Amino acid sequence: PDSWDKDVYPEPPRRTPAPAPQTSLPNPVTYLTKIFDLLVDRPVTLAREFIEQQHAKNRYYYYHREFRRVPDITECEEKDILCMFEAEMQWRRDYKVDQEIVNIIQERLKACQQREGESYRQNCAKELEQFTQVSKAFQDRYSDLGAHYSARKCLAKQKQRMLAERKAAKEAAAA
Template sequence: MPSDYDKDAYPEPPRQTPIVDKQTTLPNPALILTKLFYYSVDLPVTTFRELVEGIHSGNKYNYYHQKFRRVPELTECTEGDYTCYYEAEMQWRRDQ
């Protein structure tokens, strides 16, 4: 800056932005909508989900105990039946 800087023409900006203290009787509509959404949608859905998860936690189904029906062995599969080959191979691996 030049040495002949005129402080009256260009005052220094404030160091911090002042906090605006709004004095109003009307509440903030964003807060009202947020609370309305929370109590009308979020809270009931969360409560229902926790209730359902509590019920399901006692009735766990273990998929690794699934019973598979027996399929023909690899020697009994017709020639070119790749699905039968695959199922027979998987059954053989499960039986080991």
């Protein structure tokens, strides 16, 4: 189904076994599935075709909204309130997008754990690593800002981290 992008939400090829009946005893599962199909799926399918043709009779579109880039808080004057407002709004939108990125990675991790069955501790190591990386990035960017968070506080936290990194690297280089 084209309803979502397959690259964003990867799924393995879904290999499934074939039936190899070793006895002549007829199973109840196949008959139950056959009667379920005949009694449930067909009426649902016909209703969906009717609804889909009704929708196709009246086709109209809606669009995704694009947002231009604006100067961020690093290139805003100390007391210039208009550029601070624009930078703040941009930073808030980027924060929301980052939240949704972490959501997507977490959904990937959950789907992997459910799908892999009993070998999840091995077959989901890539997803676990990717979530670890995204979690580290998000935690560095946004954690400990507080309830009254803003772009200025995020910038100050980044600046303090960069000072610490520069000092540690300088000390290691000259040792």
